[PDB]
Amino acid sequence: SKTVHYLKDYQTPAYHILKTDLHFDINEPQTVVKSRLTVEPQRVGEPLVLDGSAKLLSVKINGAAADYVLEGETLTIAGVPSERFTVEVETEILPAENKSLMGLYASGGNLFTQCEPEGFRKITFYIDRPDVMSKFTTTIVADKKRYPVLLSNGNKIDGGEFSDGRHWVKWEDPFSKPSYLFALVAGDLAVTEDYFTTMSGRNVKIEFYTTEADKPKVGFAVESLKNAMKWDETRFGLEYDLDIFMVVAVGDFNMGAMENKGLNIFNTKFVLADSRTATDTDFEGIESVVGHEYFHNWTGNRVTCRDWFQLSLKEGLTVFRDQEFSGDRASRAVRRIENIRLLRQHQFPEDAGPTAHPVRPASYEEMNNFYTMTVYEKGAEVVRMYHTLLGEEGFQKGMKLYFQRHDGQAVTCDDFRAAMADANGINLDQFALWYSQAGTPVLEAEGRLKNNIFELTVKQTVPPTPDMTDKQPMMIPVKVGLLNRNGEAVAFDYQGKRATEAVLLLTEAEQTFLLEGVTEAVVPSLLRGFSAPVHLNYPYSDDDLLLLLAHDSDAFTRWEAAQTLYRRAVAANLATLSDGVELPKHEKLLAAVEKVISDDLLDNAFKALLLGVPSEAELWDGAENIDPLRYHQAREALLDTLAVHFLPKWHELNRQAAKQENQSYEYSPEAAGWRTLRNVCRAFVLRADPAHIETVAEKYGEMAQNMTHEWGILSAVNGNESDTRNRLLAQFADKFSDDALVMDKYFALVGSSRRSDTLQQVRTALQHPKFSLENPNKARSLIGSFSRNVPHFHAEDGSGYRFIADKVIEIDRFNPQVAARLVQAFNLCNKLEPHRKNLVKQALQRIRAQEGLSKDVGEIVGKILD
Ligand SMILES: N[C@@H](CCc1ccccc1)P(=O)(O)C[C@@H](Cc1ccccc1)C(=O)O
Ligand SMILES: [Zn+2]
């Protein structure tokens, strides 16, 4: 009797809602919501079924008290007119009691909403599904001194005052929308005003709302929005469609931001920065996410989702758009590698684990569990493959046809694919499998130069996943090139064209590609630009990898050669540590890294990436009976070797980076590149010479010229067993006690430390006056960081597992979304060595045994355990 939602069961709704008129009467403590729905029968005579979980005060049909039944979270009216009719629902909400941060809730003494995916039903009774689109008008009444700012979607068309100190506003959004895009804000908030003029000459008023204290940190977000608006015009030909665009910052928020039409609501983390309190990465994040939410105005809002299985239709596409925006801003190659690295570090384990799902899932119990790395980041890689197959011009032809066909509609992934296919006159039927088949495809490649042909044989395979065993061959673009003995590009003939690069389109289980007219011995460069989201196996020698790393023209393949050398070095460490003998010499790797360190032609941020070692999760990919501490030990040994071996050169590279930064402490991509390299150097220095922390501490103020430097130094020393580490962290918390986003950084350092005493420091931090478990940013920073802290989470005595399971249980009582994300710390369960596996299963069984456990957490626990 447990409810599962299946894509195969989709049916159009029995009723449409043409008009949604809302009235909010905000009081202390309760808010009363009145709705009036103009309902249009589609299947005449069916019962009207409304979703809702708010306290119900009354229901009318055509103005008279309705005969209805309330059952669970539904309201059913059996006796429906056969003609257009209205329904009026009155509900009552206590927003200060709402710690789920879905629906209408309080934060910092103000009121905010979050409705995606199914939060609107926590406000009123509604047909709360995204293929039902309605024109909203929203009236808000509140005390003026307490709630001077009253916002909802669209245009402000009326307002006024009452003699008792109350005031009101009325907002009309002329664009039909699904309920998940509804927003309301009521509060005492400061505003920052700006504008943008569209290419048709229309001014758009821009308003950012923040606390009074936070206002000085919102400027970069405003600038980023104007950049995003211009970019969507120049790159996609897309113009904004209202004369007002509002953004509201909120400190209590389950995700990063939300694209509500004309009234975006952002986590403070993705809108507030200055150089004193935010890192360069934080600035890049604001640019990315402000872009993302604005880009949803077309890819999400103007064209929306038929059903929640199609989430990647808007999210994969909009992530692709924010990636392209950021790459067009600056540093495209480095940013592309950053994106690839995040996918392989976080999404690949998802696809290999118990919660693996297709980009377009076929079923779900709780839709909030499917806002995933797969739907978003793999979703974006799928959209990018259209770009790779079609080119920018062809891709834009597809976009044009997509909007022509589907503006104002709620559609499917299939419709996006068809627009791409039809606009370009190409068959993309096989491409559909990128949406329906889960798992990381594995390509096995072999190469031979015989006659004057380089014959590249490639096989593909996709593993069964828990949802599906049968996996058919997919359409996989493999971008390639060839290097001669001196690492020079070598031209070849393919499909009657002589070039140095080609896209090989693998569509069968096994294919041979003939690169003809090759006049010299070659080493192939494969999967350039990470041209498909796959695992590629090709037999490279260490010397082949050094060649690629030294001379290849593609950023990804150069970086992947280094990643491979690191991976092989860790594997060699695993072996020696296991045999109880001396560590390997790693002579070739050390020679390779020396070259990278000493190369002054390398981009600084690219050099920093070449000096990064794959994470433990990457290293144990594909393994069984995993002891995570053995992998941690082997990785730490490699980092120690790199730190100590090159210690003088790490200091020298640091000095060179400092000189080039040139005291330009504000955010810019140029200065940030130097600081990124500097922070890599700091990490290695303080590994090799932990005593250097006292030298750092002595001159801390001189060093602390922005938060990128403070964060970089505190990160570097965070695992140091000196008392000074603890003192510097305490001083950081004191300095920045009043800045909640910097206190998030403090708590992340507490939870992530490799020091031996981290569990007890974490437990003390739970009682820190600036910590709140009910704040998702804080919970994520402290507890989330601890759950990803390999030696502590995976402690042999099980203390890490017991602690995280305790917190899943505690958090689930008020915020199931946060708890269900946290409990995925346990996803490695069935791949662990027996002792830890036993303890993880005990932890999961204890979570399962909780009375009233959320559907959110229960769905995840079932996938891991059952
Ligand atoms: N549609 C929004 C998520 C909806 C939601 C559901 C429940 C609770 C709160 C909000 P989004 O995709 O635009 C926000 C997204 C922004 C993002 C994602 C990937 C890259 C860059 C930006 C981040 O939170 O992952
Ligand atoms: Zn999004």
Tab-separated table of C-alpha atoms in Angstrom, residues 16-346:
chain	number	residue	atom	x	y	z
A	16	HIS	CA	-7.709	22.600	-15.525
A	17	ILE	CA	-7.409	25.739	-13.448
A	18	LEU	CA	-7.716	28.850	-15.590
A	19	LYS	CA	-7.439	31.459	-12.840
A	20	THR	CA	-6.023	31.373	-9.318
A	21	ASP	CA	-6.971	34.310	-7.119
A	22	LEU	CA	-5.246	34.282	-3.723
A	23	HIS	CA	-5.644	36.350	-0.544
A	24	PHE	CA	-3.162	36.182	2.333
A	25	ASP	CA	-4.117	37.729	5.695
A	26	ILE	CA	-0.925	37.683	7.774
A	27	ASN	CA	-1.417	37.883	11.554
A	28	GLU	CA	0.394	36.812	14.725
A	29	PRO	CA	0.778	33.837	14.759
A	30	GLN	CA	-1.542	32.644	11.977
A	31	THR	CA	-1.856	33.406	8.279
A	32	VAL	CA	-5.246	32.804	6.680
A	33	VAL	CA	-5.233	32.007	2.997
A	34	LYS	CA	-8.280	32.287	0.807
A	35	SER	CA	-8.248	30.965	-2.697
A	36	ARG	CA	-10.650	31.226	-5.573
A	37	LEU	CA	-10.069	28.834	-8.441
A	38	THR	CA	-11.694	29.107	-11.851
A	39	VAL	CA	-11.973	25.461	-12.832
A	40	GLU	CA	-12.460	24.103	-16.355
A	41	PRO	CA	-13.629	20.506	-16.734
A	42	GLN	CA	-11.562	18.340	-19.104
A	43	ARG	CA	-13.199	15.039	-18.224
A	44	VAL	CA	-16.688	16.185	-17.312
A	45	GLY	CA	-18.259	14.487	-14.323
A	46	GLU	CA	-15.086	13.263	-12.638
A	47	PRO	CA	-14.566	14.050	-8.989
A	48	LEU	CA	-12.527	17.139	-8.299
A	49	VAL	CA	-9.464	16.059	-6.336
A	50	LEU	CA	-7.330	18.689	-4.638
A	51	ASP	CA	-3.988	18.141	-2.923
A	52	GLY	CA	-3.501	19.828	0.439
A	53	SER	CA	-2.041	19.532	3.901
A	54	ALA	CA	-2.807	22.921	5.478
A	55	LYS	CA	-5.480	23.298	8.136
A	56	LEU	CA	-8.800	23.533	6.343
A	57	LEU	CA	-11.322	26.131	7.518
A	58	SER	CA	-13.900	26.060	4.693
A	59	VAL	CA	-14.653	24.969	1.105
A	60	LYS	CA	-17.168	26.439	-1.306
A	61	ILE	CA	-18.301	25.516	-4.778
A	62	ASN	CA	-19.856	28.328	-6.809
A	63	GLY	CA	-20.041	30.334	-3.593
A	64	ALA	CA	-21.968	27.753	-1.563
A	65	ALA	CA	-20.594	25.438	1.136
A	66	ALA	CA	-19.349	22.312	-0.599
A	67	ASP	CA	-20.072	18.713	0.100
A	68	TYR	CA	-16.583	17.237	0.254
A	69	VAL	CA	-14.426	14.705	2.042
A	70	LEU	CA	-10.938	15.207	3.430
A	71	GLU	CA	-8.816	12.060	3.396
A	72	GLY	CA	-5.107	12.196	4.104
A	73	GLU	CA	-3.724	15.030	2.032
A	74	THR	CA	-6.586	15.180	-0.414
A	75	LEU	CA	-9.847	16.991	-0.648
A	76	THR	CA	-12.473	15.458	-2.927
A	77	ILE	CA	-15.684	17.039	-4.242
A	78	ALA	CA	-17.858	14.432	-5.990
A	79	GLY	CA	-20.662	16.678	-7.106
A	80	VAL	CA	-19.049	18.895	-9.688
A	81	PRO	CA	-20.751	21.115	-12.231
A	82	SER	CA	-20.377	20.048	-15.855
A	83	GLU	CA	-19.652	23.681	-16.740
A	84	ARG	CA	-16.939	26.115	-15.625
A	85	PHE	CA	-17.205	26.688	-11.899
A	86	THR	CA	-15.327	28.083	-9.009
A	87	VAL	CA	-13.943	26.621	-5.833
A	88	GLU	CA	-13.043	28.727	-2.804
A	89	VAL	CA	-10.756	27.275	-0.170
A	90	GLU	CA	-9.859	28.797	3.166
A	91	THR	CA	-6.813	27.472	5.034
A	92	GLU	CA	-4.820	28.479	8.099
A	93	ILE	CA	-1.058	28.329	8.457
A	94	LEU	CA	1.335	28.795	11.368
A	95	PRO	CA	4.531	29.731	9.459
A	96	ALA	CA	6.769	30.018	12.548
A	97	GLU	CA	6.083	26.324	13.260
A	98	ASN	CA	7.236	25.334	9.758
A	99	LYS	CA	10.749	24.016	10.114
A	100	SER	CA	10.519	21.980	6.838
A	101	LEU	CA	11.118	25.202	4.862
A	102	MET	CA	8.564	24.084	2.311
A	103	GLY	CA	5.336	25.957	1.800
A	104	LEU	CA	4.996	29.186	3.732
A	105	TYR	CA	7.559	29.587	6.506
A	106	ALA	CA	9.298	32.039	8.780
A	107	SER	CA	12.937	32.975	8.669
A	108	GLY	CA	14.686	35.850	10.434
A	109	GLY	CA	11.314	37.276	11.445
A	110	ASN	CA	10.168	37.411	7.823
A	111	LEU	CA	7.986	35.128	5.684
A	112	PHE	CA	9.064	33.219	2.595
A	113	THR	CA	7.783	30.402	0.392
A	114	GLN	CA	9.259	27.386	-1.322
A	115	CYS	CA	6.833	25.507	-3.560
A	116	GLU	CA	8.957	23.344	-5.882
A	117	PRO	CA	8.097	20.528	-6.304
A	118	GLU	CA	4.970	20.041	-4.127
A	119	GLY	CA	5.029	22.771	-1.527
A	120	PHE	CA	2.113	24.820	-2.793
A	121	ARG	CA	-0.275	22.184	-1.411
A	122	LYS	CA	1.072	23.095	2.061
A	123	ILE	CA	-0.416	26.568	1.524
A	124	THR	CA	-3.840	25.776	-0.016
A	125	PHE	CA	-5.734	22.944	-1.622
A	126	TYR	CA	-4.840	22.764	-5.283
A	127	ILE	CA	-4.240	20.623	-8.322
A	128	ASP	CA	-0.542	20.753	-7.447
A	129	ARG	CA	1.067	19.274	-10.570
A	130	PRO	CA	3.047	21.120	-13.203
A	131	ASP	CA	0.910	20.337	-16.268
A	132	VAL	CA	-1.830	22.452	-14.642
A	133	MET	CA	-1.035	26.072	-15.491
A	134	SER	CA	-3.083	29.003	-14.253
A	135	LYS	CA	-2.987	32.817	-14.180
A	136	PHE	CA	-2.334	33.962	-10.594
A	137	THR	CA	-3.358	37.156	-8.844
A	138	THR	CA	-2.257	37.531	-5.238
A	139	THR	CA	-3.461	39.951	-2.559
A	140	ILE	CA	-1.418	40.256	0.639
A	141	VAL	CA	-2.520	42.063	3.832
A	142	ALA	CA	-0.206	42.576	6.834
A	143	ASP	CA	0.919	44.919	9.561
A	144	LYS	CA	2.884	47.667	7.826
A	145	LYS	CA	5.574	48.217	10.431
A	146	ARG	CA	6.327	44.501	10.788
A	147	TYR	CA	5.896	43.573	7.111
A	148	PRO	CA	6.542	46.695	5.033
A	149	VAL	CA	7.668	44.662	2.031
A	150	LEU	CA	5.013	42.449	0.459
A	151	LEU	CA	5.915	40.630	-2.725
A	152	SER	CA	4.495	38.018	-5.065
A	153	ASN	CA	4.996	37.083	-8.714
A	154	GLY	CA	4.446	39.509	-11.534
A	155	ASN	CA	3.266	43.103	-11.635
A	156	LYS	CA	2.098	45.149	-8.657
A	157	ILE	CA	-1.304	46.417	-9.804
A	158	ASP	CA	-2.872	47.864	-6.616
A	159	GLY	CA	-2.295	48.496	-2.930
A	160	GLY	CA	-3.337	50.668	-0.035
A	161	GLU	CA	-3.488	51.363	3.659
A	162	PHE	CA	-5.856	50.560	6.498
A	163	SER	CA	-6.492	52.794	9.546
A	164	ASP	CA	-5.412	50.036	11.983
A	165	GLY	CA	-1.790	50.028	10.762
A	166	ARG	CA	-2.255	47.274	8.203
A	167	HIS	CA	-1.519	47.660	4.502
A	168	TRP	CA	-2.029	45.563	1.408
A	169	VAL	CA	-0.750	44.905	-2.091
A	170	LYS	CA	-2.078	43.069	-5.148
A	171	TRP	CA	0.202	41.281	-7.623
A	172	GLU	CA	-0.860	40.065	-11.051
A	173	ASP	CA	1.261	37.583	-12.969
A	174	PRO	CA	-0.057	37.518	-16.524
A	175	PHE	CA	1.854	34.375	-17.534
A	176	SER	CA	0.080	31.084	-16.868
A	177	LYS	CA	2.177	28.982	-14.580
A	178	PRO	CA	2.262	25.784	-12.606
A	179	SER	CA	1.900	26.080	-8.838
A	180	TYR	CA	5.554	25.207	-8.160
A	181	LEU	CA	6.522	28.660	-9.465
A	182	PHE	CA	4.335	30.560	-7.013
A	183	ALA	CA	6.192	32.740	-4.494
A	184	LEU	CA	5.385	35.124	-1.661
A	185	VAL	CA	7.622	37.178	0.577
A	186	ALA	CA	6.549	39.388	3.501
A	187	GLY	CA	9.103	41.137	5.582
A	188	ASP	CA	11.228	44.005	6.771
A	189	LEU	CA	13.872	43.835	4.036
A	190	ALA	CA	16.260	46.316	2.469
A	191	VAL	CA	16.265	46.800	-1.283
A	192	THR	CA	19.037	47.319	-3.816
A	193	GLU	CA	17.780	48.733	-7.123
A	194	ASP	CA	19.261	48.592	-10.615
A	195	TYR	CA	18.005	48.039	-14.161
A	196	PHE	CA	18.669	46.353	-17.471
A	197	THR	CA	17.500	47.505	-20.901
A	198	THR	CA	16.462	44.646	-23.174
A	199	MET	CA	17.428	44.486	-26.799
A	200	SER	CA	13.933	45.706	-27.761
A	201	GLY	CA	14.542	48.816	-25.654
A	202	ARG	CA	12.453	47.989	-22.586
A	203	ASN	CA	13.793	48.785	-19.154
A	204	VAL	CA	13.603	46.035	-16.574
A	205	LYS	CA	13.600	47.198	-12.983
A	206	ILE	CA	15.906	44.983	-10.877
A	207	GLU	CA	15.324	44.742	-7.119
A	208	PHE	CA	17.402	42.632	-4.695
A	209	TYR	CA	15.974	42.240	-1.202
A	210	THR	CA	18.249	41.406	1.732
A	211	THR	CA	18.556	42.172	5.433
A	212	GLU	CA	19.696	45.726	6.116
A	213	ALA	CA	23.050	44.366	7.341
A	214	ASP	CA	23.547	42.135	4.259
A	215	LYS	CA	22.819	44.829	1.640
A	216	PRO	CA	26.493	45.839	1.185
A	217	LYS	CA	27.248	42.257	0.024
A	218	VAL	CA	24.690	42.028	-2.807
A	219	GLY	CA	26.429	44.049	-5.564
A	220	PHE	CA	28.221	41.217	-7.308
A	221	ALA	CA	24.923	39.305	-7.591
A	222	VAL	CA	23.300	42.312	-9.220
A	223	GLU	CA	26.150	42.687	-11.702
A	224	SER	CA	25.984	38.978	-12.437
A	225	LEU	CA	22.274	39.196	-13.220
A	226	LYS	CA	22.827	41.980	-15.725
A	227	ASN	CA	25.573	39.890	-17.308
A	228	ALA	CA	23.220	36.858	-17.451
A	229	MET	CA	20.419	38.918	-19.044
A	230	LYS	CA	22.741	40.238	-21.738
A	231	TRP	CA	24.194	36.801	-22.376
A	232	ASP	CA	20.858	35.110	-22.865
A	233	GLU	CA	20.137	37.751	-25.521
A	234	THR	CA	23.430	37.466	-27.336
A	235	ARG	CA	23.945	33.669	-27.098
A	236	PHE	CA	20.350	32.321	-27.197
A	237	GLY	CA	18.359	35.300	-28.500
A	238	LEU	CA	16.161	35.203	-25.400
A	239	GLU	CA	14.656	38.372	-23.863
A	240	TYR	CA	13.067	38.917	-20.485
A	241	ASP	CA	9.299	39.305	-20.518
A	242	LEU	CA	8.336	41.547	-17.581
A	243	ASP	CA	9.428	45.050	-16.563
A	244	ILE	CA	10.341	43.854	-13.028
A	245	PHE	CA	12.728	41.157	-11.770
A	246	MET	CA	13.018	40.589	-8.024
A	247	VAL	CA	15.518	38.506	-6.089
A	248	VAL	CA	15.116	37.842	-2.353
A	249	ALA	CA	17.868	36.440	-0.128
A	250	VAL	CA	16.919	34.033	2.680
A	251	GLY	CA	19.191	32.415	5.259
A	252	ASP	CA	17.043	29.350	5.876
A	253	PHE	CA	16.650	27.481	2.586
A	254	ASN	CA	16.847	23.813	1.587
A	255	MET	CA	18.642	24.271	-1.730
A	256	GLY	CA	20.613	26.959	-3.481
A	257	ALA	CA	17.920	29.081	-5.122
A	258	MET	CA	14.533	28.998	-6.845
A	259	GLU	CA	13.365	30.416	-10.191
A	260	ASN	CA	9.888	31.610	-9.219
A	261	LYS	CA	8.589	33.822	-12.052
A	262	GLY	CA	9.785	37.392	-11.538
A	263	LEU	CA	10.519	36.680	-7.854
A	264	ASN	CA	13.521	34.428	-7.418
A	265	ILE	CA	14.366	33.333	-3.857
A	266	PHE	CA	18.009	32.607	-3.133
A	267	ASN	CA	19.950	30.994	-0.348
A	268	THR	CA	22.199	33.796	1.033
A	269	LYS	CA	25.154	31.620	0.035
A	270	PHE	CA	24.451	32.252	-3.669
A	271	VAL	CA	23.767	35.974	-3.490
A	272	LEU	CA	26.028	37.569	-0.782
A	273	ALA	CA	29.752	38.245	-1.116
A	274	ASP	CA	32.519	40.627	-0.502
A	275	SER	CA	36.265	39.936	-0.618
A	276	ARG	CA	36.580	40.143	3.171
A	277	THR	CA	34.064	37.360	3.790
A	278	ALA	CA	33.676	35.331	0.603
A	279	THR	CA	36.148	33.247	-1.384
A	280	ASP	CA	36.744	33.476	-5.126
A	281	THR	CA	34.872	30.151	-5.453
A	282	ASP	CA	31.925	31.743	-3.607
A	283	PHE	CA	31.897	34.614	-6.135
A	284	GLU	CA	31.987	32.100	-9.010
A	285	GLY	CA	29.087	30.298	-7.372
A	286	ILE	CA	26.987	33.447	-7.198
A	287	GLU	CA	27.648	34.143	-10.865
A	288	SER	CA	26.681	30.573	-11.760
A	289	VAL	CA	23.502	30.401	-9.694
A	290	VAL	CA	22.227	33.926	-10.445
A	291	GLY	CA	22.680	32.937	-14.085
A	292	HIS	CA	20.952	29.570	-13.572
A	293	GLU	CA	17.835	31.030	-12.007
A	294	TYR	CA	17.521	33.742	-14.653
A	295	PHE	CA	18.009	31.165	-17.445
A	296	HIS	CA	15.085	29.176	-16.048
A	297	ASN	CA	12.853	32.048	-17.129
A	298	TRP	CA	12.799	30.364	-20.538
A	299	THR	CA	14.050	26.849	-19.767
A	300	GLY	CA	11.611	26.012	-16.995
A	301	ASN	CA	9.078	28.839	-16.773
A	302	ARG	CA	8.062	29.759	-20.330
A	303	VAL	CA	8.348	26.081	-21.192
A	304	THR	CA	7.812	23.889	-18.140
A	305	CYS	CA	7.615	20.142	-17.204
A	306	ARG	CA	4.640	17.904	-17.952
A	307	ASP	CA	5.405	15.863	-14.837
A	308	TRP	CA	8.218	15.547	-12.330
A	309	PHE	CA	9.856	12.614	-14.125
A	310	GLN	CA	10.824	15.248	-16.715
A	311	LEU	CA	12.774	17.361	-14.175
A	312	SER	CA	15.991	17.149	-16.236
A	313	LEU	CA	14.154	18.817	-19.157
A	314	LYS	CA	14.576	22.079	-17.239
A	315	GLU	CA	17.454	21.270	-14.917
A	316	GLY	CA	19.908	19.572	-17.286
A	317	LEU	CA	19.284	22.235	-19.856
A	318	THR	CA	19.523	25.118	-17.393
A	319	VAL	CA	22.706	23.709	-15.819
A	320	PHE	CA	24.154	23.479	-19.347
A	321	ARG	CA	23.170	27.119	-19.870
A	322	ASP	CA	24.781	28.246	-16.579
A	323	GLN	CA	27.938	26.283	-17.467
A	324	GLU	CA	28.117	27.935	-20.881
A	325	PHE	CA	27.489	31.374	-19.360
A	326	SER	CA	30.321	30.927	-16.880
A	327	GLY	CA	32.663	29.578	-19.542
A	328	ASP	CA	31.916	32.510	-21.829
A	329	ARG	CA	32.668	34.882	-18.890
A	330	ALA	CA	36.178	33.545	-18.272
A	331	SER	CA	38.456	30.516	-18.087
A	332	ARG	CA	36.361	28.135	-20.167
A	333	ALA	CA	38.749	25.138	-20.203
A	334	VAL	CA	39.495	25.193	-16.477
A	335	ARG	CA	35.827	25.607	-15.621
A	336	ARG	CA	34.958	22.703	-17.957
A	337	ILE	CA	37.447	20.474	-16.099
A	338	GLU	CA	36.003	21.584	-12.763
A	339	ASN	CA	32.589	20.432	-13.996
A	340	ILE	CA	33.956	17.069	-15.226
A	341	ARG	CA	35.724	16.552	-11.894
A	342	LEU	CA	32.550	17.195	-9.887
A	343	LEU	CA	30.596	14.805	-12.084
A	344	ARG	CA	33.097	11.980	-11.693
A	345	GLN	CA	33.556	12.586	-7.972
A	346	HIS	CA	29.868	12.778	-7.069
